[PDB]
Structures are given as structure tokens and as C-alpha cells.
Amino acid sequence: SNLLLQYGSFCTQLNRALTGIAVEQDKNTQEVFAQVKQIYKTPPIKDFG
Amino acid sequence: TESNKKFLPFQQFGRDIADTTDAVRDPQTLEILDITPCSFGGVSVITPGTNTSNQVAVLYQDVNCTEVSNVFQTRAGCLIGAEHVNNSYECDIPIGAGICAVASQSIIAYTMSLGAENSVAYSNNSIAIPTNFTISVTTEILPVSMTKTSVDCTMYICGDSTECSNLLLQYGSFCTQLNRALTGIAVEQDKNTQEVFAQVKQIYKTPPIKDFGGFNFSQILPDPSKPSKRSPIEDLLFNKVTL
Amino acid sequence: PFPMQMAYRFNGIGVTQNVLYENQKLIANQFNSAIGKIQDSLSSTPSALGKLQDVVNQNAQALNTLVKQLSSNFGAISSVLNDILSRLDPPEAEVQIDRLITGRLQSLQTYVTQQLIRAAEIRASANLAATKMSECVLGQSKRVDFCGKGYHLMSFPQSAPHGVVFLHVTYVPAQEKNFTTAPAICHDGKAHFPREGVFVSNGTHWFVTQRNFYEPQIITTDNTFVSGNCDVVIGIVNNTVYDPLQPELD
Amino acid sequence: QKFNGLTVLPPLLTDEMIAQYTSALLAGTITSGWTFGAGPALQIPFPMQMAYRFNGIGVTQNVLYENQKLIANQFNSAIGKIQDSLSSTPSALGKLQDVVNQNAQALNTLVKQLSSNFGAISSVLNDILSRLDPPEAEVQIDRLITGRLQSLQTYVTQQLIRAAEIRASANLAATKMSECVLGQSKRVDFC
Numbered sequence A: 001s002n003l004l005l006q007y008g009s010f011c012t013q014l015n016r017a018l019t020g021i022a023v024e025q026d027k028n029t030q031e032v033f034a035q036v037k038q039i040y041k042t043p044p045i046k047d048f049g
Numbered sequence B: 001t002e003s004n005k006k007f008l009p010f011q012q013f014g015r016d017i018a019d020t021t022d023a024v025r026d027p028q029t030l031e032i033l034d035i036t037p038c039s040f041g042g043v044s045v046i047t048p049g050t051n052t053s054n055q056v057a058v059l060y061q062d063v064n065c066t067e068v069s070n071v072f073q074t075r076a077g078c079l080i081g082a083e084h085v086n087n088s089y090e091c092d093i094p095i096g097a098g099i100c101a102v103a104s105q106s107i108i109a110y111t112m113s114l115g116a117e118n119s120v121a122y123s124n125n126s127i128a129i130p131t132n133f134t135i136s137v138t139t140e141i142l143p144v145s146m147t148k149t150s151v152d153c154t155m156y157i158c159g160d161s162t163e164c165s166n167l168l169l170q171y172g173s174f175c176t177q178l179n180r181a182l183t184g185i186a187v188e189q190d191k192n193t194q195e196v197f198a199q200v201k202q203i204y205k206t207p208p209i210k211d212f213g214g215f216n217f218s219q220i221l222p223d224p225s226k227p228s229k230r231s232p233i234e235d236l237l238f239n240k241v242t243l
Numbered sequence C: 001p002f003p004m005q006m007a008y009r010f011n012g013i014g015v016t017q018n019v020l021y022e023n024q025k026l027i028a029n030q031f032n033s034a035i036g037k038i039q040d041s042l043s044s045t046p047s048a049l050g051k052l053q054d055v056v057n058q059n060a061q062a063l064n065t066l067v068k069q070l071s072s073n074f075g076a077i078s079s080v081l082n083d084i085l086s087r088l089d090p091p092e093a094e095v096q097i098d099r100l101i102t103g104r105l106q107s108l109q110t111y112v113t114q115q116l117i118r119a120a121e122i123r124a125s126a127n128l129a130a131t132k133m134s135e136c137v138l139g140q141s142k143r144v145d146f147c148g149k150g151y152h153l154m155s156f157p158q159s160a161p162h163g164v165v166f167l168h169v170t171y172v173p174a175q176e177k178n179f180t181t182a183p184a185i186c187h188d189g190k191a192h193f194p195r196e197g198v199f200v201s202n203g204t205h206w207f208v209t210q211r212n213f214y215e216p217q218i219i220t221t222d223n224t225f226v227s228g229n230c231d232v233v234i235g236i237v238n239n240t241v242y243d244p245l246q247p248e249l250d
Numbered sequence D: 001q002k003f004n005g006l007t008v009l010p011p012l013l014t015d016e017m018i019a020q021y022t023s024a025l026l027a028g029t030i031t032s033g034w035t036f037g038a039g040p041a042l043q044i045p046f047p048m049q050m051a052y053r054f055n056g057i058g059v060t061q062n063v064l065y066e067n068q069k070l071i072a073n074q075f076n077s078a079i080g081k082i083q084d085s086l087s088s089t090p091s092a093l094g095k096l097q098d099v100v101n102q103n104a105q106a107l108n109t110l111v112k113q114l115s116s117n118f119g120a121i122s123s124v125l126n127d128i129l130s131r132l133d134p135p136e137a138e139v140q141i142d143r144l145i146t147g148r149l150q151s152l153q154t155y156v157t158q159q160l161i162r163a164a165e166i167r168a169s170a171n172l173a174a175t176k177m178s179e180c181v182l183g184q185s186k187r188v189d190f191c
């Protein structure tokens, strides 16, 4: 590890890119699915004509 | 730990997919022990912010709550410092696996609510119709270009020294692929800005009298009395982003 | 004339022109107040400009780390190559330089690749901004949630450092009511269907109204049309249809 | 799975909450048509909604009312057939299985790189440390750091590209979510 410390900041660039991807995946799921301001519920009687 | 894998009489140690040690057979008995790497993981800090409070909670992402003041186990790890409350709220600080996290002068963790419950009074002879109407204006912000940076490969790597320049010249064309790529990005930023904005071949101009039937556009139209002829909103945007 | 422009923009989303002209003053007040609120919204809610701040911060950080990679030994006896060239013999300065050429070229490669990927992201965001500029300010979009939540009327573009801000003016149904309905009207054997809008009742009388704004109208032969008979349509109510010709001949 | 230094964080929205969101969107589409996207949920009988959707494609609404039972039977038959269609034709879920396969293969091929000497004397750093004196182990450990770091860099680069592709697919999915489920699209073969 003390020898690795002589390669600068590669080991935080990788762990900031991976975190960027990690948060981008939750942004993707939220942007696709969370488009309703309320959670609507269907009526108990399925008389839809 | 104990294992239920029946090793054959001739193998001593077992391997898992992608070349790792999974289990080993105790030489002094017939027992077969599985070897699991002991719990480890990154450590995450939940903070409301030094602007508000210096209270902090800390989450160990992949350990139980048996490895070092409330302590709550979640599917995302063991979170210490936050009290789990049963009632759901809007998600604030993301934790993971459905729990988000400040209220009542302490850090709380809860299962996120997805929104208010609202059933629709469905019937095959009832229609709702609006009897009035609101006009809303929303703001949508999109990036179009970024700073056209350029880095001189040879002078960056090999600062003003011919001795290193000879080795860099022995590394071939790298110091030309990098300049070519950065030049391509620089020109593509101008193409982006042109395609976003240069959509009118001629420059139209507003009339001097703002008799728009009661609509007031003074907040989006350029103000000639300003040195840079920008709208008040555009002023707020240029004064709101800091470098 | 701009009020007629907005009246046609109402027509384009299924609200007849007469809603605007009778309510032009209220529409003006709501538009002006919303534009006024935009200032407070942008100036008081942080992270509102986050999408624009993030790119400049990412580029500044990439440059900062790129420069900080110059302060790294990479296996060399020192970071400053001037000291190796001034202190070591070339037969060994060659080897000491190689272990800085490699690390600084690798840092440059990392930076260039990250910039290519982020440039592709900005390329996609710029193309989306161009598409919204074409289809929201330059015209009117019927595609929902593309020019903001609600029924789109218009958009106004604004410049921003390294970006664009759209003010989307949209129509949202507000106070609402619960009315009885029917898919057709049975009159002397003929089935009447609305040309535009639906039939509504408050219990006692049947009217026709546009679906996106309550405006009751008497049922006549010029807003309804006849097809088939009363025994085919499931769920019909019985009301009478008035023909303006009857009072003109009587 | 869990190896040396590799973790998988759980998604913030669990499958239960995703299912609850799609249930909310389905209840909206069923009980209020497209109006729950624009503003408040406005109650409309489902046949009148489908009559609107016929009106929007140039077929007069009466065609629905006169053929309501046939329309219902065809819609129920198609919805029933969708299960057999996707459950009986293989590769139907290839677009979702391929993402998982590529991520798992990238992780396995990141781990496999640890068992490569990279030009040194033994792929285990502890073995070179235990057999060579530090002044000489330094070079072999430099090899086992440079190669492994280059492998991690390649993995992260390919994950950035794949994340960009999946983000493009997610953006198209959100566009379809708005312009196909929340409303009705005049864009041909887009929905």
C-alpha cells in the first residue's frame, strides 16, 4: 500500500467513476418509473366494460 | 466453518469458480472446512450537513450488527447512529435497499414512501371534468457544451527537456492521438452550441411597445439598459453559478 | 396578435378558443405571477442549477487531478525531472525518466478517455436540447411530458453558461367536478354521439361539453351525429335532441 | 457473490417499490386515461376512454360502442397470449439477460486477472515478498501493481461505456413511459 501511494490518485478516480455509475443507475430507475405524484389504486370491482 | 461438500478421498482442498480457495479437508481428520473471507466493506457516512448540524451516522455496507448509539440492520448494511422509525417519509438521504434518512434533532432511517395514496372513484357512469384551470411555468435545465480544454502532450509529460523528449518520441504517436482527440472534442462543443441555438437564419427583433394583451414578457426579453443585453432571469443564471 | 396565438395554442390541445378570450385577464395574471415566481424558485432553491454546475465541477476536478499527477514519483527518485537531469548521469537519467513518462502518459490517457465519454454525454444532452428547441419553442408539441408536465402551450429559451434553460408554459386542469355520463343519447330510435366532448348530467338535464374544460351546451343536431340505433350501444340514457330548425319554422 | 474488494450495492428502489409504481401507473391508465399525467386524476369510464383513443387514430368513437364486446374479447385474447408468447419463444428476454451476463462476465474477468503473473515470478504478491528481498521484490511488485491497475482501468472504462449505453436505453424507456403509457402517441411504430 505504501508503494501504491506513489501512483497518485488513480485509486480515487476509479472509485469516483464507479460511484457515478452507481448513482446513475438509481437516477435511471427513478426517471423511468417515478413519474406519478401519487400512488394510485385500482377499485375492488373490475367492471371495466 | 463446517461444510456439506463431500470431497473425494484424493483431493485435499477445493476451488470455486474463477480460481479461489473455497474449502479444504482437515489433514488430521475427515472433516471438510469451508473458508469464507471475514466480513469487510466500505464505510459510508450519513450527514445532514455542517450547515445544519454536526450530527453524523455511519453505515457499514456489508457486515452484520455484531462487529464494531442506536444500531439498525438493513439490507444495505449495519447502520449505527440513526434510529429506525416505523412511519414512512419522502426520500431524503439515500442509503440503499429501500431506506432513506433528519428529524426531531436526530438522524432517522425509514422505508421510503412512494407518494400519497389516492384511489380513483371509478364508475361506468361518472366522469370528472375540470371547472377551471391553472397555467404553470416550469424550468428545465440542460447542458449544451463544456470547457474546451487542451493539454499539450509532450510539454505536459516532458517539461522543456530534450532528454525526455527523445524517449517520448520513442513512444510513437501517443502525443498526436491525444491532441487529435482533444481538438475533436473542442470543435464538437461548438457544433453542439450551434445546433442548440443557431436554429433561426435571421435575427428577429421585438417591437418597442409591449402591448401584448396583458401578458408581461419583461422578465425574459433583453434589457437594453444593461451592458450585456441579457434578461433578468439570464442575469440570475449568470450570477447563480459560481466557478 | 399574441392573444390569438395563445387561443390557437389552446385549440391545439383540445380547448376551444372561447375559454381564453372570456378569461384573458385571469390567464394574464396567472402567467405573470408564474414568471415572477420563477425568479424566486431559481434564486432560493439550491441544486436548481446542479445539472450545469456538475459538468464544470467534473472538468475542473479532472484538470486538478491531471496536474496533481505531476506531483507523483511513479517509482522515480523524485517528481521534478529537472532534478534527475541535473543530478543523475544520462545512463541512469534515461531509466529515471521512463518511470515518469509512463505514469504521466497513463494519466493523460485516463483524462482523455474520461473527456471523450463526458463529451458523448454532453453531445446527447445537446441533441436533446436541440430537439426540445425545435419541438417546444419553435412549434408546439403534442407529446406529453416532453415539454414539461401538463398540456404544452409554449416554451421560452434562455441562455446559461454552458447550457440552456427552458421556461415551459403549460395548461393544467384545476378545480374539478363529478358528473354523471353516458356514451350516447337515444332519441326516437337513433343513437347520438358527440362530435367533440362528452355528455354530462347533473341528475336532471343532459349537456355536451369539451373534455378538458367544463362548458355545458344544449344537445343539438350540429354537435352530435347519428349512427346505428339504441339497441347496439351498451349504456344509453334517454333525452331529447333539439334542432334549431324547429323554432325557425314554428 | 463476494470476492476480494468487490462489492455490490443494493438498488435504492426495491422490486416491490418498482411494482408499486407500475401498479400506480396502471391504475391511472385504467381509471383516468392520460389525464393523470397532465394534472389531477379525472375519472372516466373505460369505454369512453377507449372511444377517445379511437377518435385519436381517425376511427369514429361509435365503432367502439357497436363493437365493444368484440374489442373486449380481442384485447383479452391478446393479453392472455402475451404470456405464452414471451414464455415460449426463447431469447425474448435477451435484452435484459445480456446486461446481467456482461456485468457478471466483466467481474469474473476482473477477478481472473489476479491469477496472472504479468511478467513477474509468481502471481501472488506474498510469495514474491517471501522469496525475494525487498530491494528486489520492489520491481516484481511494481509489475503486479501496474498490470492489475491497468486491468481495473480497462474494467472501469468498459463500465463507463456500458453505463452510457444503458442510460440511453433508460432515457428511451422514460420517453416511452411518458409518450406511450401516460398519453397516446401519434408517432408511428414508436409505441
Ligand SMILES: *[C@@H]1O[C@H](CO)[C@@H](O[C@@H]2O[C@H](CO)[C@@H](O)[C@H](O)[C@H]2NC(C)=O)[C@H](O)[C@H]1NC(C)=O
Residues within 6 Å of the ligand: B131, B132, B133, B134, C026, C030, C174, C175
Ligand atoms: C380559477 O382559478 C383562478 C386562480 O387559480 C382564480 O383567480 C383568482 O386567482 C388568485 C390567485 O391567482 C386568487 O387569490 C383568487 O382567489 C382567484 N379568484 C378571484 C375571484 O380572484 C379564479 O377565480 C378561478 N375561477 C373560478 C371560476 O373558480
Ligand SMILES: *[C@@H]1O[C@H](CO)[C@@H](O)[C@H](O)[C@H]1NC(C)=O
Residues within 6 Å of the ligand: B121, B123, B126, C178, C179
Ligand atoms: C362525486 O364525487 C365522488 C368523489 O369525488 C365520486 O365517488 C362520485 O361517484 C361522484 N358522483 C356522485 C353522483 O356522487
Ligand SMILES: *[C@@H]1O[C@H](CO)[C@@H](O)[C@H](O)[C@H]1NC(C)=O
Residues within 6 Å of the ligand: A047, B123, B124, B125, C234, C235
Ligand atoms: C355498469 O353498467 C351496468 C350495465 O351497463 C350496470 O348494471 C352497473 O350498475 C354499472 N355500474 C355501476 C357502478 O353502476
Ligand SMILES: *[C@@H]1O[C@H](CO)[C@@H](O)[C@H](O)[C@H]1NC(C)=O
Residues within 6 Å of the ligand: B210, B216, B217, B218, B219
Ligand atoms: C412587467 O413586469 C415588470 C417586472 O419588473 C414590472 O416592473 C412592470 O411594471 C410590469 N408591467 C409592464 C407593463 O411592464
Ligand SMILES: *[C@@H]1O[C@H](CO)[C@@H](O)[C@H](O)[C@H]1NC(C)=O
Residues within 6 Å of the ligand: C186, C187, C188, C189, C236, C237, C238
Ligand atoms: C328509452 O326510449 C325507448 C324508446 O325511444 C324505450 O324503448 C326505452 O325503454 C327507454 N328507456 C331506456 C332506454 O332506458
Ligand SMILES: *[C@@H]1O[C@H](CO)[C@@H](O)[C@H](O)[C@H]1NC(C)=O
Residues within 6 Å of the ligand: C202, C203, C204, C205
Ligand atoms: C343542473 O342543471 C340544470 C340545467 O342548467 C340547472 O337548471 C340546475 O340548477 C342544475 N343543478 C341541479 C339540478 O342541482
